Design a protein around this nucleic acid. Structure first.
Ligand SMILES: [Mg+2]
Ligand SMILES: [Mg+2]
Ligand SMILES: [Mg+2]
Ligand SMILES: [Mg+2]
Ligand SMILES: [Mg+2]
Ligand SMILES: [Mg+2]
Ligand SMILES: [Mg+2]
Ligand SMILES: [Mg+2]
Ligand SMILES: [Mg+2]
Lengths: 66, 188, 116, 151
RNA sequence: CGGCACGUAGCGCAGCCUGGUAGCGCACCGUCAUGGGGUGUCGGGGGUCGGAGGUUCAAAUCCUCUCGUGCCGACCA
RNA sequence: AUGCCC
RNA sequence: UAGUCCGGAUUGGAGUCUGCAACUCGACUCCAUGAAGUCGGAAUCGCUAGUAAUCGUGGAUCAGAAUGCCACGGUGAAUAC
């Protein structure tokens, strides 16, 4: 680590909409207003609404039948 | 400071004989039987651009000259001097009125013109093939009774005059080819 | 000023701003602002962060860019793989809803290609 | 036209001030037969100009016209191989009419926000001998004084 | 035989010296003008350098060897 | 001023 | 004053109706999508007054299927030396 050459690196608290605050060192300077983090991102409960297969025959015999 | 022999120079080389620069356009070497071989060279007097023909005896010729031609971007003519700047040497290379022979009319600005300078002084200017100029004085294109081709003379921003079809009025930039001196487009 | 993964401009009103999403037109944005209780004459600047999170919940109730382009392309490809008439039309880049092609297909055929 | 010269129609003056030439002006501005919107635009511009100029809108309008109104103009003839530019006087109704036309064309070209503001700027600059309108007047006088040798 | 000077768009030529963009005329294509053709006007497209191998960061250009062509004289006994 | 032919 | 709260083309999904039957190939609606286009080259057209320009409405044909055609009014110019 040289002395003058790097930007300021200070501790910043980041607040999410999951309601949790992420205290972390960073270079943004100010605080942080975060919207979506890891523990709230729909990556565990989204792998079905994200894949959206469906079935044509089911939709059909729903719309009408014999 | 290099001296060239007649049976040495093929086309392209620049010579300095008689204190006038020349440039070999073509040269056929003849070696007859039972005679002293020689060469019929077609020279280009690099000062007036007029061809002269010489037959040079195998024995001797002359030294080369400082005839170099490269693109120099026209800058401005102030008074009688046409300045340039090498793109890469950025030199205030200057010519003069004789050096610019009736190419002035084809010269506007920011024009990269290949020039030939002899011993650090440009003796000639070659205007680029096409040049965008703007008409400044032209009567309207009133068709009237024409049943044929016709045309229209048009004074340009450099003094140059050229025939333009009918529709170009004033404020139109017309592409004209410096070689012939004739209209090519309306530059849209 | 950040919703469903895309950045939304700040100087414009909320409805137009929300339309800046892929999957939200003007009526959809009107519905969003209604359900969230946020007015329409308000610009994105000067909103509570909380208000913005409410908007996020509503648009999540809808469907937007990622899943939308996924299902669009999936349907298109289902067509192009069946090889039904609409499929072949998609494949060849011609109008599908039955327009004329003797002229005026410039949108599906791009610019015109002269003979060579 | 060719057969028989014919009289000009009558125009009813404007409501606000009741001036025939101002009513002509709205007309020139008018497009699509939207006389009402044209009236609104010209009235708003006149208000703005009166406020910028002090004296009433009538003398404001009229000094703008006194500046843009030409007196000689040129019409081509194509005599022989070359076409000509004959400088001919302009009769008063014509100079008024095309002065208004040049003004409104300048305005339409101008790059302000609303047409009332464009027209206001144009009338102001014309009153103070500026703008594309008086530029056109100058060009026309200049073409005539160039081709003066013809008559 | 060598020296030599070429080989570039359908055809005629530039560019090459002094490597980093292949251009210029005719032709060619689509309108327009015309009763129709032509002249004319307005738009556009076209090869990437005879072939091979090396120098280089990079070759139509610099090298070298080929191939197709031109001109040259190949003499004194 | 230009204007050829069916 | 943005390719925009302009423009609506194209396309996905979901429907209505007429009609034995809307795949080739109807119109229409809702959601989403948001091309080209920033006034148009040479060249060319219409118009002299309730005209041009602009805005809507009706009819024939017809089950459905018009930006066309035939009609109707609303506003309403410039210019002709
Ligand atoms: Mg919609
Ligand atoms: Mg159809
Ligand atoms: Mg001035
Ligand atoms: Mg002007
Ligand atoms: Mg013949
Ligand atoms: Mg565009
Ligand atoms: Mg604009
Ligand atoms: Mg009539
Ligand atoms: Mg109508």
């Amino acid at each position: 680590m040289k002395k003058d050459i790097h930007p300021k690196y200070e501790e910043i608290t980041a607040s999410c909409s999951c309601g949790n605050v992420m205290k972390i060192r960073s270079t943004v300077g100010h605080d942080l207003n975060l919207d979506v983090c890891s523990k709230c991102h729909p990556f565990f409960t989204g792998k079905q609404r994200d894949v959206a297969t469906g079935g044509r025959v089911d939709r059909f015999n729903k719309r009408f039948n014999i | 400071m290099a001296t060239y022999y007649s049976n040495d120079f093929r086309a392209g080389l620049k010579i300095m004989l008689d204190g006038e620069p020349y440039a070999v356009e073509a040269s056929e070497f003849v070696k007859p039987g039972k005679g002293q071989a020689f060469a019929r060279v077609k020279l280009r007097r690099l000062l007036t651009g007029t061809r002269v023909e010489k037959t040079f005896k195998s024995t001797d010729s002359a030294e080369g000259a400082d005839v170099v031609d490269m693109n120099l971007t026209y800058l401005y003519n102030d008074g009688e001097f046409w300045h340039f700047m090498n793109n890469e040497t950025f030199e205030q290379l200057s010519a003069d009125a004789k050096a610019i022979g009736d190419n002035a009319k084809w010269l506007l600005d920011q024009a990269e013109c290949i020039v030939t300078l002899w011993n650090g002084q440009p003796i000639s200017v070659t205007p680029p093939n096409f040049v965008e100029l703007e008409i400044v004085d032209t009567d309207p294109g009133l068709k009237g009774d024409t049943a044929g081709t016709g045309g229209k003379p048009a004074t340009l921003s450099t003094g140059a005059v050229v025939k333009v079809p009918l529709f170009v009025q004033i404020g139109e930039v017309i592409k004209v080819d410096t070689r012939s001196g004739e209209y090519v487009s309306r530059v849209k | 000023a950040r919703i469903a993964g895309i950045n939304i401009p700040d100087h414009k009103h909320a409805v137009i701003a929300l339309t800046s999403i892929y999957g939200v037109g003007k009526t959809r944005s009107k519905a969003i602002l209604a359900a969230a209780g946020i007015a329409e004459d308000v610009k994105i600047s000067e909103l509570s962060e909380g208000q913005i999170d409410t908007l996020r919940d509503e648009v999540a109730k809808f469907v937007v860019e990622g899943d939308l382009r996924r299902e669009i392309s999936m349907s298109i490809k289902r067509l192009m793989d069946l090889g039904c008439y609409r499929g072949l039309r998609h494949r060849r880049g011609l109008p599908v809803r039955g327009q004329r092609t003797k002229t005026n297909a410039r949108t599906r055929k791009g610019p015109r290609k002269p003979i060579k | 036209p060719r057969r028989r010269v014919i009289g000009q129609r009558k125009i009813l003056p404007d409501p606000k001030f009741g001036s025939e030439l101002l009513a002509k002006f709205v007309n020139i501005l008018m497009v699509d037969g939207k006389k009402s919107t044209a009236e609104s635009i010209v009235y708003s511009a006149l208000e703005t100009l009166a406020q910028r100029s002090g004296k009433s809108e009538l003398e404001a309008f009229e000094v703008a016209l006194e500046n843009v109104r030409p007196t000689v103009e040129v019409k081509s003839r194509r005599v022989g191989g070359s076409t000509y530019q004959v400088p001919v006087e302009v009769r008063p109704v014509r100079r008024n009419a095309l002065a208004m036309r040049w003004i409104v064309e300048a305005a339409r070209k101008r790059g302000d926000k609303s047409m009332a503001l464009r027209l206001a700027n144009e009338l102001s600059d014309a009153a103070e001998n500026k703008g594309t309108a008086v530029k056109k007047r100058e060009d026309v006088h200049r073409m005539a004084e160039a081709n003066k040798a013809f008559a």
